Amino acid sequence: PALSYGGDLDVTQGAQTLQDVLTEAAKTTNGLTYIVNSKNELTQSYAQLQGDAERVLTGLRALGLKAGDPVFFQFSSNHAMVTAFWACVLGGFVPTLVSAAPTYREMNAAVKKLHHAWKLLEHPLILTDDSLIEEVQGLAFLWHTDQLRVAAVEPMLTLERDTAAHPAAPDDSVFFILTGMPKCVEHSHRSVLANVKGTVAANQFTQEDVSLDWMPLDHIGGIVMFHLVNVYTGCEQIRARTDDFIAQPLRWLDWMDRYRATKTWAPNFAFAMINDYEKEISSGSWDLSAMTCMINGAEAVVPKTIHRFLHLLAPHGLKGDVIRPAFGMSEISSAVVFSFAIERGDENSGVLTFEETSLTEQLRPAEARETGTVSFTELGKPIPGITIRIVNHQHELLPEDHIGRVQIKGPTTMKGYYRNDEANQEVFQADGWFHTGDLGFLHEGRLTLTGREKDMIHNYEIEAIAEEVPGVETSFVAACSASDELILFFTPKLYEPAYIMRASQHIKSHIATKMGLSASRIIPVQKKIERAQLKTRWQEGAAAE
Amino acid sequence: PALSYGGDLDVTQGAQTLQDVLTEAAKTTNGLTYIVNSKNELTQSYAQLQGDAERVLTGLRALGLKAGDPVFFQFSSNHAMVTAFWACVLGGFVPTLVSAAPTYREMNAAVKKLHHAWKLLEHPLILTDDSLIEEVQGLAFLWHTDQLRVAAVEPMLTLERDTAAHPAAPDDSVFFILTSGMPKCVEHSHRSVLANVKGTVAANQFTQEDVSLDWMPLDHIGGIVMFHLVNVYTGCEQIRARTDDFIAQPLRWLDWMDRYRATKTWAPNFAFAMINDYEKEISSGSWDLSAMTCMINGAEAVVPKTIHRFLHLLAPHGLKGDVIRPAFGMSEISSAVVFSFAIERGDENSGVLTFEETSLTEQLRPAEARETGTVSFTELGKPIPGITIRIVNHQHELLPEDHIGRVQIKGPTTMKGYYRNDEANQEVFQADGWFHTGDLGFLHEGRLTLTGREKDMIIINGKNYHNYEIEAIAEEVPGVETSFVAACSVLILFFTPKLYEPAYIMRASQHIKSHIATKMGLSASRIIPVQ
Numbered sequence A: 001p002a003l004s005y006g007g008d009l010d011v012t013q014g015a016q017t018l019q020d021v022l023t024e025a026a027k028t029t030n031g032l033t034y035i036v037n038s039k040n041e042l043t044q045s046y047a048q049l050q051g052d053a054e055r056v057l058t059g060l061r062a063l064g065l066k067a068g069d070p071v072f073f074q075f076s077s078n079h080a081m082v083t084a085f086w087a088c089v090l091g092g093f094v095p096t097l098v099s100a101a102p103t104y105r106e107m108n109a110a111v112k113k114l115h116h117a118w119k120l121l122e123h124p125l126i127l128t129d130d131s132l133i134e135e136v137q138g139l140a141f142l143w144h145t146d147q148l149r150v151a152a153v154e155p156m157l158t159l160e161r162d163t164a165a166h167p168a169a170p171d172d173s174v175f176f177i178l179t180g181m182p183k184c185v186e187h188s189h190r191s192v193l194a195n196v197k198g199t200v201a202a203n204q205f206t207q208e209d210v211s212l213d214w215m216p217l218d219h220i221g222g223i224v225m226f227h228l229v230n231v232y233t234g235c236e237q238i239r240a241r242t243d244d245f246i247a248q249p250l251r252w253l254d255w256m257d258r259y260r261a262t263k264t265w266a267p268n269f270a271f272a273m274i275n276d277y278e279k280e281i282s283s284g285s286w287d288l289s290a291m292t293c294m295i296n297g298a299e300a301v302v303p304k305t306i307h308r309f310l311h312l313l314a315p316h317g318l319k320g321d322v323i324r325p326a327f328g329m330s331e332i333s334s335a336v337v338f339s340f341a342i343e344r345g346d347e348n349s350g351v352l353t354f355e356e357t358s359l360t361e362q363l364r365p366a367e368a369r370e371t372g373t374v375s376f377t378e379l380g381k382p383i384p385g386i387t388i389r390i391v392n393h394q395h396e397l398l399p400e401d402h403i404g405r406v407q408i409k410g411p412t413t414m415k416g417y418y419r420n421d422e423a424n425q426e427v428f429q430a431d432g433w434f435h436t437g438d439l440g441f442l443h444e445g446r447l448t449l450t451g452r453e454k455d456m457i458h459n460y461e462i463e464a465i466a467e468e469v470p471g472v473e474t475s476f477v478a479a480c481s482a483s484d485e486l487i488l489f490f491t492p493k494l495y496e497p498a499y500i501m502r503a504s505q506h507i508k509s510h511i512a513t514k515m516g517l518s519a520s521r522i523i524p525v526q527k528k529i530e531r532a533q534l535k536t537r538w539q540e541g542a543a544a545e
Numbered sequence B: 001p002a003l004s005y006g007g008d009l010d011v012t013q014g015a016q017t018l019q020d021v022l023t024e025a026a027k028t029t030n031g032l033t034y035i036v037n038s039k040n041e042l043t044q045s046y047a048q049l050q051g052d053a054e055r056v057l058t059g060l061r062a063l064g065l066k067a068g069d070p071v072f073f074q075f076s077s078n079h080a081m082v083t084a085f086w087a088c089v090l091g092g093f094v095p096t097l098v099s100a101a102p103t104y105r106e107m108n109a110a111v112k113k114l115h116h117a118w119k120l121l122e123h124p125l126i127l128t129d130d131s132l133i134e135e136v137q138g139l140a141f142l143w144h145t146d147q148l149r150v151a152a153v154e155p156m157l158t159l160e161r162d163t164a165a166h167p168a169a170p171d172d173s174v175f176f177i178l179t180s181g182m183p184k185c186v187e188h189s190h191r192s193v194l195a196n197v198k199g200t201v202a203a204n205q206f207t208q209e210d211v212s213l214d215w216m217p218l219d220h221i222g223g224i225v226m227f228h229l230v231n232v233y234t235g236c237e238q239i240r241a242r243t244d245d246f247i248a249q250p251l252r253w254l255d256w257m258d259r260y261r262a263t264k265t266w267a268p269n270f271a272f273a274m275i276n277d278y279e280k281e282i283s284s285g286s287w288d289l290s291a292m293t294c295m296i297n298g299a300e301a302v303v304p305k306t307i308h309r310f311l312h313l314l315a316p317h318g319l320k321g322d323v324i325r326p327a328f329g330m331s332e333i334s335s336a337v338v339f340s341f342a343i344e345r346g347d348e349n350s351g352v353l354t355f356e357e358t359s360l361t362e363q364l365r366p367a368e369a370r371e372t373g374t375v376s377f378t379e380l381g382k383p384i385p386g387i388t389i390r391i392v393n394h395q396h397e398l399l400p401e402d403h404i405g406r407v408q409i410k411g412p413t414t415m416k417g418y419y420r421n422d423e424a425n426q427e428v429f430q431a432d433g434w435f436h437t438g439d440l441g442f443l444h445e446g447r448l449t450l451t452g453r454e455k456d457m458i459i460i461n462g463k464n465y466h467n468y469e470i471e472a473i474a475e476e477v478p479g480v481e482t483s484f485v486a487a488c489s490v491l492i493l494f495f496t497p498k499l500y501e502p503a504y505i506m507r508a509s510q511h512i513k514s515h516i517a518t519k520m521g522l523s524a525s526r527i528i529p530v531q
């Protein structure tokens, strides 16, 4: 059946709290390196991190923080945030990992979400940078509150070390992380370390790895899949600012080369962004021969994006098997599946193609064609300790090669959303099954995501019918919440105004007839040549936004 | 400012718990009449209601229910549901008011929402009809659970009367009701529900002589509170019909009003428009609607066209032209909190306010209705006694009158909160004791007028915008007569061209994307121009 177990995970081996992770890491000579620019870097050994964290701990306790208290992180500096995180670990304080707002001068969406979590956590101390404390302090006027408390981390780095680490238990909450209003994922040392240990075993991570990450530390893959995995293995890890990558994506290449990185990760959009620079890549020089692990996860992994990425960077020494698709969620401590089958020389390896007609039934393999076939990137087997299953509308187990609702069982699951019993019921189903909200199938024990529940009105059938209209070259439907309406994008064979209005009328009326919808339910939108796929360009727009 | 207090409401006056309400009602000879069909009915005096509720109480207590335990309601029959509700009041049990599922054979949205509530309430006994109990028991297979418990009301009607009522306190929970995503479980007390009853009775001057007619579901807050509980509190005669019977043949509404000489009734705006569809059948029928004095219209946007048409069409049948009363409320505030007494058949501008469509972002400017360039809204009236309404901007700052903003409510009718959801309770329970409704509107002369919902606003670059604000920028484009914009989630701007020609329409469509993308700093890809 569509139920895959990753095998036994011995979580008794190794550290049991994050304090023990930092202690064992501080015994190595490895640590962190924070990139400032192409020439300058700031180093912080794991031994220095421990002392720095103890210094910050002195200031936090001076502000009255007691073990169990939450701490609201609002950082632009990786150095200050990493240090602040471990100070909290030492003090038994619970960090709330959430990105800083794009601006603090007006009551925008990001600022509203921060207020919600801040109020849900009963007005916790906000910890931030010197470069942000002025902005963050403005929230006192935006929120019309006298309960705002802010403090910068850098001033604390000049304090005496507080060597009295609060004794933590594996089930103690280790941090909150934010996902409408965001929910407050509460994790323990046990759930995080279980993902770390599972991730290390599946990928064979070691203390000799060299890690490069520019993704936000407020993203679960930034904090757990990399930062904590790196400290747990005690390997060398290089941190870059997210802003610096999206400003100049080719810096990713420079960084992998300059530090001889062996592993890194990004969502699929970053790979597509690099592919947009083929001209300047074909006139550049990088040594990427040390890179062994480029994890691709957090959103849909597009086969043609990763293949082009491997092709473009092959002359620069990137082996064709470094890209590892992965899937995970903050609620399950980051990635729980990894695919080791993507190969530059085999576009079909680790990629599954099926007939569009069979999406609602037993999937029927096919050879990729211009139309009528869909290609999905396999995301691999569960890591040790994780069980995945695929279920139908009634939560009944499905067989393999059947698209259904993905559910996860294992030791990496959050304690739950903070202060929301009702939301915890929706996701925590009977017998330990966490409901992801994602759609996919299992094939040879390997998970493949195909969509989301919120992404439900079949869009392959709507597009096929739209393409029978003579004026339509190709089509793309997205659903859109007075009416539940589907917006039908199309390329006309001819971008002439009369021709477009004819095709638009036929699209509306031909879809209304063939599928028994109201013509009012279909909106036709007309859309040179672009090389980047449409699904890939929208990934880039939402990411850099 | 845009803040209106409805006046002081003496809550210490009158019954303080629903037990007291039924006891007083039972002293009258009035009660309920359940409509079976045109030629049949079942009657249940308030005294008989108390006795029937005492018998059901014997069955519920026989099932082990204790004071404070919830009870899941799944009813096709109003008589059984009303009796169950009061049996739970006598026993201190907390009914969970939710409509029956359209079908228990398949796993539809309704059944999922029931499981969520049922699970949230920790598997309460489900109380249902002997008619429906067969399908309800099917949830055991559909939900794949062995903890389901179901019982029928009717068999319990043969048991002895348990006259030992649990002593209730005003702040005890009196019932749960599900919101209309997954629904939330609104929890109310006798105090909050009775505060709304008392304010509503005072605003409308309801009395023991009213004759009430209601076909709306008792799982709707206006069905249980605004009418049923108001009617028991006033001790008046109330007629109950089944909701399906009305939808089957809407004109039965007129039949019932005529047959029972009803003085008050209610429905959402659609029901009035349903009747308007039947102009032909109404022109060849005969009703005496002269006793009707109060037709509440609420739960949806009140369309001036629909109500004024409705009034002209039933006037030959004796419907007075002032009977329709727009109203707004929410289950979280236990039903209506404003009533408008200004609608009139002979003056289609009374109780209605029209403005220049350009004055909507700042101080509204009154106007004379026009074919284009003006919008008109139905006033929903002053707060009932005890309620305070205010309008606020995106920073929760008070606004002046004639300004559109977020509507907030304060008063004694507010729920305890959403059951087992601290987070959602924070979102709606704002500082200074204000409840965030999620609706938009303005105050004018102390009267509330709604103009939209927050879920309808367009969010771009994390900033929020009204539909009309975008429309005014779109209007500036040459060749755009009028426009309407409706937010999209993956900006659908619908416009009328000055001249209907392909190239003329295509280029006005291009200047709408360029002019708005420029003025709002948005990606042209995000602007969809539809003619």
Ligand SMILES: CC(C)CC(=O)C(=O)OP(=O)(O)OC[C@H]1O[C@@H](n2cnc3c(N)ncnc32)[C@H](O)[C@@H]1O
Pocket: A179, A220, A221, A225, A296, A297, A298, A299, A300, A301, A325, A326, A327, A328, A329, A330, A331, A333, A334, A335, A336, A379, A436, A438, A449, A452
């Ligand atoms: C550490 C990373 C591997 C991922 C992660 O852990 C994360 O992304 O955490 P996040 O909570 O932020 O969001 C979770 C939601 O991202 C979606 N998602 C993640 N990976 C995906 C993939 N490979 N393909 C398609 N969709 C994917 C999914 O829908 C999921 O439920």
Ligand SMILES: CC(C)CC(=O)C(=O)OP(=O)(O)OC[C@H]1O[C@@H](n2cnc3c(N)ncnc32)[C@H](O)[C@@H]1O
Pocket: B179, B180, B221, B222, B223, B226, B297, B298, B299, B300, B301, B302, B326, B327, B328, B329, B330, B331, B332, B334, B335, B336, B380, B437, B438, B439, B450, B453
């Ligand atoms: C009159 C009461 C019995 C209605 C009621 O109490 C109810 O309708 O209960 P409900 O909680 O189910 O729904 C609440 C949501 O209905 C919307 N709503 C209600 N009345 C409205 C009106 N007059 N005009 C426009 N919208 C209205 C509003 O958005 C509100 O927040």
